[PDB]
């Protein structure tokens, strides 16, 4: 534990906290919150704050279905931005039906349950270090984003002169006051692109920290007259924002991927784990890669995983086991993007490794070669299958797979497919500016 | 014949024809040509006009390969439009390999085949009535197409006032003084949209006529300060211009579908010709609707099909059949849009008849009841199939189909796939205005 | 203060949501909820069943007070989280008298019809009067349509206890005038000044010739 019920109460009083945000998460990964005044704290902690629970299913909403909000006390946090009357606090919450029981459609409760399937196999932790990237634009007069990037820096440049803006520098400062464990932070490939990297953490613990990131980003961005965005491929020709995910399975406090007594220095647990992330890969991309734009980033060329392979050095090696070992022995999945729902994306990768280990799966050869270099046939001569290329292709892969569907189960799986099918359709039925420049005269 | 070689000379001289156009057609139905002065006509009729045939690949051309231009004397036409130096004349020609054998990758010499493959099955004529719809936009100051519709007319309306603009009437009169057998026209559903149907004609003459429609339309349009276009879906959310194809097969000069004494008034040739067309439609879609934009018209509700089946009436059926019998016995295919190459559309359509007539296949239930009504679990539960949604669906689907693959013949085929795969890749790798506006803030 | 204009206009923009103001009503009797009943069907007394039963009758009639603007009815168009149909449920999309699962004191009957445009004091007058008239006359609540109602055809809805509400304000009035229980709920003075003022409001609107009316008719006709 990290906070006593009395611990929360005292902080508020002496801290003039005057407004509570009971935040949680709709299906698309959007940050949701119902807020209440500090005077309704009891009602919150006693888990009796109700709300229209149908907000979780995003835009596919049908009925008004009342539902409960159970605050995780450990999530509790207070923001350095004070109102003109009182500081504000937050509470990451779980959603319960009116019958005291978990709501299956809640992505938070959908990961707590794939973590359990984990325990049903002995493990104690599944740690998670995300490498979440983003872009910062300028805001015009009214307050809209333009497409004027914030800075003209490139890969790892000392890239914004310290005296001045430094949204990156100033975010990483406010994040550390809020009790985050930031590893580093550099300037990514395209001008105006930035990356901040996290210290590992319990899955759901880190997911909570990936919502808090995205939220503190877009806020401080705004504060610097800017506009932060997590769209994967904001612009053609430039880089796309990724969110590599450093994963590892501990057992009784010890990294189960490690073995300084096996080929490649990888426990036979790990090899298996890897095994399954490949089987399902095509079948779980629709979750790690929710949006239409996400696939404009998975075109071979801008260092983005097009190819289902497991190396250590490659141009788009979908899987990458980095240098370090021991405690820090972990698989890297380089194909996620910032838009991926963390809670879900995580449940879907686990369920992947899990069915992998659970069924003892036989891992392929590490294509140490550069995969990119060859033709699709040369790439077919080995186990090189490229990913789904359109949201449709990715959504069909998903449905056809059974282990990814129990990873989300009836409710979640049911509503995701619908929202996404409408989304694609919306995009396909549309006639784009490109089609007119490309056709209106040619035909 | 229609013009002896003697007459051709009789006409060039007497009509002060000073410039000649040896017109042909590349893989995407773009009207290509080569411009020789009249002082150099003889060389042409003798079949000795060399040219770079890699141009028939359009934009996928690679190396400059030598080819010969053999004219079709029957195609001799003189446009009213004269540079102030003399008049212009034309010839639709067959592209002939330099050794003298017909080039097999040429679109006109590839239907001339599937007609001989029809001739080599008993029939004398494959006839065609095309219903070609085109939009009219106002050219701006700079002489740029704008999205201004030339008028706000509507279905079958009295389109632009007579005295005023009426550009559609003009286009028709210019085609009257050119030996075009046109039946009747009207104003189409959308504002500025137009339709102009000709009498029926032998597959080749009808296409020849098609291609030449498109040119005179575009041309009579600029004259009136407009841009006419044959783009399936120029504007999202308004009608799309599609081009129906009324097919009828003759056998000894009489309709082989008619039968005043079989069910519905159609022979077993008819029932069979339909029966074949049903099979491969899904598969010959990637040729009747060749643009990414084509599928932005095959969206339910726009007088445009989505479902593979025949009827007597029906909203937007795929193979509706007109009540009219006799010679006017025929099977309309409402799928095609004005974007398809006239010569290839017919190749593939004849091949899915001849394959149905040959194998004696059997036509499913002519769904006479509305099909847009039935749920996806009410349609595909009968003979009712969706067509491909994206072009890449249509291709993957078109590649895997021996009867169509063979209808075009190795050369045409593979260059087609490539060029088309190139077209889709371009489109999927673009990041449209929509993709930002749906994702630049939300994410 | 923050350089903004907040508004309580039911339907400021065509084709986007409309701001409506629900009203969760509960009648106490000796300090305790008179609707609750842990031992009657659905968990509602015969007072509850009756209070609903009255509200159903006159809704069509007290609509011209819960949604007082011409614009109010530009929100009561199917699909915008806003009712059109007179009936109660446990769940339902945009029901008119949905009832929250919560019981105890928190036993209550929500009326989702009202928009922020109604006069707070008159909305309640008329709503209390269609309860007290239901509780008094002991009226009986029809079938709580628990199944979706937006689904049923006009020949599938009005074939049950399901009624449309008035579409135009003038429908709502003609309909509100002819209704003794509401006419009496407000009392001669308030009533007649209300009709007038309102009749004035509609007349103004019907006699205007909007931009739409030209753009749909200036060329076509
Ligand atoms: N047990 C673990 N589970 C998941 N990720 C981890 C673990 N340990 C380290 N990582 C991640 O691996 C990445 C590589 O950083 P590195 O400097 O090699 O790590 P360390 O210094 O901890 O060995 C970091 O982003 C970190 O978040
Ligand atoms: N014998 C035929 N075979 C194929 N198509 C035909 C034939 N006769 C006419 N058509 C075409 O069919 C279309 C439908 O017109 P419709 O008025 O039904 O024809 P008709 O009056 O000749 O029966 C016309 O645009 C025309 O070009
Ligand atoms: N598009 C990149 C993002 C990460 C980076 O810029 O290194 C990838 O997935 O590899
Ligand atoms: N142009 C439409 C048909 C509408 C019409 O001709 O009225 C189509 O086939 O898509
Ligand atoms: N404002 C809507 C309800 C939508 C909501 O509260 O989410 C109405 O009652 O018309
Ligand atoms: Mg990186
Ligand atoms: Mg990395
Ligand atoms: Mg038509
Ligand atoms: Mg027709
Ligand atoms: Mg409510």
DSSP calls for B80-126: EEEETTEEEEEEEEEEE-TTSSBPSSSSTTTHHHHHHHHHTTT-SEE
Cα(B424)–Cα(B390) distance, integer angstroms: 9
A231/B436 touch (CB, cutoff 8 Å), yes or no: yes
Asked whether residue A207 falls in the same domain as residue A102, the answer is: no
- What are the residues whose beta carbons fall under 8 Å from the beta carbon of C97, sequence distance 6 or more? C52, C55, C56, C87, C88, C89, C109, C110, C111, C112
Give how many domains chain A has, as a whole number.
2
Residue of A nearest to C102 (CA): A98
Contacts of A150 (CB under 8 A, 6+ apart): A136, A137, A138, A160, A165, A167, A192, A226
Could you tell me if B404 and B398 are in contact, meaning their C-beta atoms sit under 8 angstroms apart?
Answer: yes
Tell me if C59 sits within 8 A of C86, measured CB to CB: yes
d(CA A280, CA A277): 6
What atom of ligand 3 comes closest to residue A337's alpha carbon?
Answer: 9
My answer on whether A29 and A172 are in the same domain is no
Give the three-class secondary structure for B333.
strand
C98 is in an annotated binding site: yes
Which of B106, B134, B156 terminates a domain? The answer is B106
Are A436 and B292 inside 8 Å of each other by CB? no
Measured CA to CA, the distance from residue B152 to residue B404 in angstroms comes to 41
Residues in A whose CB is inside 8 Å of some CB of B read 30, 145, 229-236, 291-293, 295-296, 299, 338-339, 389-390, 392, 427-436, 438-443
Cα dist. A378→A369, A375, A381, B400, B419 in Å? 12, 5, 5, 21, 22
Rounded to the nearest angstrom, the minimum Cα separation between C145 and chain A is: 14
Separation in Å, CA C215 to CA B212, C210, C219: 38, 9, 7
What b/e sequence results for C49-80 when a residue is b if at least 16 CB atoms lie within 10 Å of its CB, and e otherwise? bbbbbbbbbbbbbbbbbbbbbbbbbbbbeeeb
* Cβ contacts of C143 within 8 Å, gap of 6 or more: C87, C160, C161
State whether residue A184 is helix, strand or coil: strand
* Closest of C39, C72, C37 to residue C51, by C-alpha: C37
- B31 C-alpha to center of ligand 9: Å? 26
Residue the block writes with tokens 């449940």: A347
Alpha-carbon distances, residue A260 vs A204, A266, A325, A326 (angstroms): 29, 7, 9, 8
**Cβ atoms B34, B69 nearer than 8 A:** yes
Query: What technique determined this structure?
Result: X-ray
Q: Which residue of B has its CA nearest to A144?
A: B441
| CB A129 within 8 Å of CB A206 | yes
Per CB-CB distance under 8 Å, the chain C contacts of A65 are 91
SS3 A23: strand
Q: How many CA atoms lie within 13 A of A105 on its CB side?
A: 20
Closest-CA residue to B94 (of B78, B110, B77)? B110
Nearest CA in chain A to C100: A66
Contacts of B32 (CB under 8 A, 6+ apart): B23, B24, B25, B26, B55, B56
Distance CA B316, CA B339 (A): 19
Whole-number Å distance between alpha carbons of A281 and A397: 9
Q: Which residue has the tokens 């550069």?
A: A370
C-alpha–C-alpha distance, residues A94 and A68, integer Å: 8
Q: Which residues contact C195 (CB under 8 A, 6 or more apart)?
A: C173, C177
* Per-position DSSP letters for C88-122, written without gaps between them: --SS-SS-SS---S--GGG--EEE----TTS-HHH
Single out the residue of A302, A274, A303, A299 nearest to residue A388, CA to CA: A299
Beta-carbon contacts of residue C83 (< 8 Å; ≥ 6 apart): C76, C94, C95, C96, C112, C113, C165
DSSP string, B231-297: -S-SSTTS----EEEEEEEESSSSBSSB-TTSGGGB-HHHHHHHHHHHHHHHHHHHHHS-SGGGGGT
E strand or H helix that includes residue A50: strand A50-52
Q: How many helices (H) does chain A have, and how many strands (E)?
A: 13, 16
Q: What is the CATH number of the domain that holds C67?
A: 3.30.590.10
Residues forming a β-bridge with B23: B33, B92
Whether A66 and C102 lie within 8 Å, measured CB to CB = yes
Q: Is C110 annotated as a binding residue?
A: yes
Q: Which residue has the tokens 């219903």?
A: B131
Alpha carbon dihedral B41, B47, B53, B55, in 10-degree steps, equals 30
**CA-to-CA distance for A269 and A267, rounded, in angstroms?**
5
Phi, psi angles (nearest 5°) of residue A150: -75, -50
Distance A110 CA to ligand 3 centre (A): 28
DSSP-assigned letter for residue A404:
T
As a whole number of angstroms, the distance between CA A342 and CA A208 comes to: 8
Calculate helix-pair angle for C120-136, C46-66, nearest 10 degrees: 140
Whether C91 sits inside 8 A of A50 (CB atoms) is: no
Neighbours of B99 (CB within 10 A): 6
SS3 A40: helix
Rounded CA separation B286/B292 (Å): 10
Strand partners, A31: A25
Cα(A373)–Cα(A98) distance, integer angstroms: 57
In this structure, are residues A36 and A20 in contact, taking their beta carbons and an 8 Å threshold?
yes
Residue A330 φ/ψ, nearest 5 degrees: -155, 150
> How far is Cα A339 from Cα C126, in angstroms, rounded to an integer?
49
Q: How far apart are CA C189 and CA B307, in angstroms?
A: 64
- Residue linked to tokens 């953490």: A201
> With contact defined as beta carbons under 8 Å apart, do B170 and B224 qualify?
yes
DSSP type of residue B53? G
Reference B312, options B302, B324, B304; nearest CA is B324
Ligand showing the shortest atom-to-Cα distance for residue A246:
1
Element (H, E) at B228: strand B226-229
Q: Are B232 and B291 in contact (CB under 8 A)?
A: yes
CA distance A118 to C154: 53
Question: To test ligand 4's pocket by mutation, which of B230, B232, B238, B302 has the most ligand atoms within 8 angstroms of CB?
Answer: B302
Query: Collapsing DSSP states into helix, strand and coil, what is residue A56?
Result: helix
Helix axes A281-288, A342-358, angle to 10 degrees: 160
Q: Both tokens of residue A428?
A: 């396909």
User: Which of A82, A47, A38, A91 has its CA nearest to residue A68?
Assistant: A47
Q: How far apart, in Å, are the Cα atoms of B174 and each of B167, C17, C183?
A: 11, 53, 74
SS3 A222: helix
Distance, in Å, from the CA atom of A209 to the CA atom of A198, rounded to the nearest integer, reads: 9
Do residues A338 and B442 touch, judged by C-beta distance below 8 A?
A: no
Written as one string, the DSSP assignment of A349-375 is HHHHHHHHHHTT--------S-STTS-
Task: List own/partner pairs for C78-85 with CB under 8 A and 24 or more apart.
Answer: C78/C150, C79/C150, C80/C17, C80/C18, C81/C17, C81/C20, C82/C18, C82/C20, C82/C112, C83/C112, C83/C113, C83/C165, C84/C164, C84/C165, C85/C149, C85/C150, C85/C157, C85/C162, C85/C163, C85/C164, C85/C165
Residue B134: both structure tokens together: 């085109």
Are B253 and B274 in the same domain?
yes
For the beta carbon of residue B2, count every other beta carbon within 10 angstroms: 11
Paired tokens of A129: 């270090």
Residue B156 contacts by C-beta under 8 Å, 6 or more apart in sequence? B186, B187
Query: Which chains lie within 8 Å of chain B at 3 or more CB pairs, if any?
Result: A
Cα–Cα separations (whole angstroms), residue A390 to A285, A333, A395, C180: 10, 20, 9, 63
How far is the C-alpha of A296 from the C-alpha of C53, rounded, in Å?
Answer: 58
Residues 6+ apart with CB under 8 A from A116: none
Joined tokens for residue A160: 């914004």
Pairing of strands A87-96, A66-71: antiparallel
Contact B431 A390 (CB under 8 A): no
Q: Is A130 in the pocket of ligand 3 (CB under 6 A)?
A: no
Out of A231, A299, A439, name the one closest to residue B443 (CB): A231
Active site residues of A: 52, 131, 133, 188, 195, 244, 315, 332, 334
Question: Scanning every residue of chain A, which has its alpha carbon at the shortest distance from the alpha carbon of B432?
Answer: A432
Paired tokens of A127: 């740690």
CB B338 within 8 A of CB B134: yes
Angle C204-C207-C213 from CA coordinates, rounded to 5°: 125
Alpha-carbon distance A334 to A285, whole Å? 12
Which residues lie closer than 8 Å to C101 by C-beta, 6 or more apart?
Answer: A66, A98, C90
H-helix or E-strand containing B354?
helix B342-358
CA angle A257, A261, A265 (to 5 degrees): 50
The reply to whether B295 and B173 lie within a common domain is yes
Give the three-class secondary structure for A127: strand
Compute the distance between CA of residue B162 and CA of residue A237 in angstroms, rounded to an integer: 50
B101 and B212 inside one domain: no
What is the number of alpha carbons within 13 Å of residue C7 lying toward its C-beta? 7
Q: Hey, which chains touch A, using 3+ CB pairs under 8 Å?
A: B, C
- Work out the burial of residue A184: count CB atoms within 10 Å of its CB; fewer than 13 is exposed, 13-18 middle, 19 or more buried: exposed
Give the three-class secondary structure for B129.
strand
Q: A358-384: string of b/e by CB count within 10 Å (b at 16+)?
A: beebebbebbebebeeeeeeebeeeeb
- What H or E segment, with its residue span, contains residue B41? none
At A16 the three-state DSSP class reads coil
DSSP A273-332: HHHHHHHTHHHHHHHHS-SSGGGGS-STTSS---EEEEESS-SSEEEE--S--GGG--EE
Distance from the C112 Cα atom to the nearest Cα atom in chain A, whole angstroms? 11
Helix axes C46-66, C169-177, angle to 10 degrees: 120
> Number of C-alpha atoms within 13 angstroms, CB side, residue C206?
10
Same domain, A254 and A388: yes
- Tally the residues of chain A: 443
Show the tokens assigned to C58: 């006159």
Q: For residue A271, what is the enclosing H or E element?
A: helix A268-279
Q: Of A249, A318, A322, nearest to A289 (Cα)?
A: A318
Regarding the beta carbon of A129 and ligand 1, being less than 6 Å apart is answered: yes
Residue A181 sits in the same domain as residue A252: yes
Query: Per this entry, what is the length of chain B?
Result: 443
Q: Do residues A77 and A128 share a domain?
A: no
Q: For residue C184, what are the contacts with CB-CB under 8 A and spacing of at least 6? A: C129
- What is d(CA A267, CA A256) in angstroms, rounded to the nearest whole number? 7
Show the domain range for A399.
107-443
A-chain CB neighbours of B296 within 8 Å are 428-431, 435
Q: In the numeric block, which tokens belong to residue A212?
A: 């808090």
Residues 6+ apart with CB under 8 A from B68: B47, B48, B49, B50, B51, B95, B96, B97, B98, B100
The CATH number of the domain holding residue B62 is 3.10.20.70
Backbone angles phi, psi at C37, to 5 degrees: 175, 100
B34 in helix, strand or coil? strand
Pocket test for ligand 2, best of B132, B186, B245, B246 (most atoms within 8 A of CB): B246
**Nearest alpha-carbon partner for C143 in C191, C104, C92, C71:** C92
- Of A302, A352, A355, which Cα lies nearest the Cα of A331? A352
Distance of alpha carbon B353 from alpha carbon B248, whole angstroms: 10
Ligand 5, residues C7, C79, C81, C92: which to mutate, most atoms within 8 A of Cβ?
Answer: C81
**Interatomic CA distance for residues C182 and C171, integer angstroms:** 16
C110 CB near ligand 5 (under 6 Å):
no
- Cβ A440–B234 below 8 Å, yes or no? yes
B143 and B3, same domain (yes or no): no
What CA–CA distance (Å, rounded) separates B367 from B327?
24
Q: Within its chain, how far is the Cα of B371 from the centroid?
A: 26
Q: Are strands B66-71 and B77-83 parallel, antiparallel or unpaired?
A: unpaired
CA B248, distance to chain mean position in Å, is: 16
Same domain, B5 and B37: yes
CA-CA distance, B316 to B304, in Å (whole number)? 5
Q: Which whole-number Å values give the CA distances from A236 to A261, A385, A428, B391, B436, in the listed order?
A: 46, 25, 19, 22, 11
In this structure, chain C runs to a length of: 221
End-to-end CA distance of chain A: 68
Q: CA A76, A81, A82 angle in degrees (round to 5)?
A: 95
B392/B330 Cα distance (integer angstroms): 31
- Under 8 Å between Cβ of A132 and A196: yes
Give the SS3 label for residue A382: coil
Please, what is the Cα angle at A48 between A44 and A51, to 5 degrees? Answer: 95
Identify the DSSP state of C28: B
Same domain, B84 and B112: no
A278 and A405 belong to one structural domain: yes
Cite the annotated binding site of B for Mg(2+) by residue number.
131, 133, 188, 195, 244, 332
Tokens 């103001």 locate to C21
Q: From the CA of A77, how far away is ligand 1's center (Å)? A: 25
Last residue of a domain, one of A64, A91, A106: A106
Cβ(A272)–Cβ(A403) under 8 Å?
no
Residue B19 phi, psi dihedral angles, 5° rounding = -140, 135
Helix axes A268-279, A281-288, angle to 10 degrees: 70
Q: Give the span between the Cα atoms of B117 and B407, in whole angstroms.
A: 10
Q: In the Cβ-directed half-sphere of C133, how many Cα atoms lie within 13 Å?
A: 19
Q: What is the dihedral of CA A270, A276, A281, A282, to 10 degrees?
A: 160
């Amino acid at each position: 534990a990290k906070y006593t019920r009395e611990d929360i109460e005292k902080l508020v009083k002496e801290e003039n906290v005057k407004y509570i945000r009971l935040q949680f998460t709709d299906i698309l990964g959007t940050i949701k919150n119902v807020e209440i005044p500090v005077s309704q704290l009891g009602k919150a902690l006693d888990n009796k704050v109700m709300f229209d629970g149908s907000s979780i299913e995003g835009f596919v909403r049908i009925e008004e279905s009342d539902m409960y909000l159970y605050p995780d006390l450990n999530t509790f946090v207070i923001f350095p931005w004070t109102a003109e009357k009182g500081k504000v606090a937050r509470f990451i919450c779980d959603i319960y039906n009116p019958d005291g029981t978990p709501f299956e459609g809640d992505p938070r409760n959908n990961l707590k349950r794939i973590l359990k399937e984990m325990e049903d196999l002995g493990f104690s932790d599944f740690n998670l270090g995300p490498e979440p990237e983003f872009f910062l634009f300028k805001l015009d007069e009214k307050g809209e984003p333009t497409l004027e990037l914030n800075d003209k820096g490139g890969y790892f440049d000392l890239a914004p002169t310290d005296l001045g803006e430094n949204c990156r520098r100033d975010i990483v400062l406010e994040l550390e006051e809020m009790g985050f464990e930031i590893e580093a932070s550099h300037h990514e490939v395209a001008p105006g692109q930035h990356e901040i990297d996290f210290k590992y953490a319990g899955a759901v613990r880190s997911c909570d920290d990936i919502q808090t990131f995205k939220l503190v980003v877009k806020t401080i961005a705004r504060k610097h007259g800017l506009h932060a965005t997590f769209m994967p491929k904001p612009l053609f020709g430039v880089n796309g924002s990724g969110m590599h995910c450093n994963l590892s399975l501990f057992k009784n406090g010890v990294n189960a991927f490690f073995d300084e007594n096996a080929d490649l220095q990888l426990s036979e647990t790990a090899k298996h784990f890897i095994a399954g992330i490949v089987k399902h890969a095509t079948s779980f991309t629709a979750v790690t890669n929710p949006t239409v734009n996400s696939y404009k980033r998975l075109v071979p060329g801008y260092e983005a995983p097009c190819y289902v392979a497991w190396s250590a050095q490659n141009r788009s090696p979908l899987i990458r086991i980095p240098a370090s070992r021991g405690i820090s022995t972990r698989v890297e999945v380089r194909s996620v993007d910032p838009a991926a729902n963390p809670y879900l994306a995580l449940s879907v990768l686990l369920a992947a490794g899990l069915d992998g280990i659970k069924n003892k799966l036989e891992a392929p050869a590490p294509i140490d070669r550069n995969i990119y270099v060859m033709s699709k046939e040369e790439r077919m001569e080995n186990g090189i299958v490229d990913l789904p290329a359109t949201l449709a292709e990715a959504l069909e892969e998903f449905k056809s797979n059974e282990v990814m569907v129990k990873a989300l189960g009836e409710h979640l799986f049911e509503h995701f497919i619908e929202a996404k099918e409408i989304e694609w359709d919306m995009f396909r039925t549309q006639v784009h500016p490109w089609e007119r420049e490309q056709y209106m005269s040619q035909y």
